Amino acid sequence: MKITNDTTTYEVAELMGSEADELDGRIMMGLLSRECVVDTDDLSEDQWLALIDESQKVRREQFESDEA
After folding, report:
1. Are the CB atoms for 3 and 37 separated by under 8 Å?
2. C or N terminus of the chain, fewer CB within 10 Å?
3. Alpha carbon of 18 to those of 24, 25, 41, 43, 65: distances in Å?
4. Does residue 26 contact residue 9 with C-beta atoms inside 8 Å?
5. Whole-angstrom Cα distance, residue 34 to residue 66?
6. Cα(59)–Cα(5) distance, rounded to whole angstroms?
7. Contact present, 33 and 25 (Cβ < 8 Å)
8. CA 51, 55, 60: angle at the middle one, nearest 5?
9. Taking Cα atoms as reference points, which of 64, 2, 49, 60 lies closest to residue 27?
10. What gap in Å lies between CA 57 and CA 17, rounded to an integer?
11. DSSP reduced 3-state for 68
């Protein structure tokens, strides 16, 4: 999938899987931006799965850190 200024969190969430939600999409957009990924086809399988793994760490970090 190409990433543009009009890419939505829903589009990135669906890229991750049908049970991913808007928060997953938002987090992954942040990761892809950090990595300067403008086309997810440029990723290896290992890289893509590593990014998904990291998005779930960040998700947990958010839920936990918001308590304080």
Report:
1. yes
2. C
3. 11, 11, 19, 20, 26
4. yes
5. 23
6. 23
7. no
8. 150
9. 60
10. 17
11. coil
Token duo for residue 46: 């290992």
Resolution expressed in Å: 1.3
Query: What are residue 2's phi and psi, to 5 degrees?
Result: -80, 140
Q: How was this structure determined?
A: X-ray
Helix axes 22-34, 45-66, angle to 10 degrees: 120
Phi, psi of 39 (to 5 degrees): -150, 115
DSSP state of 8: -
CA–CA distance, 4 with 52 (Å, rounded to integer): 19
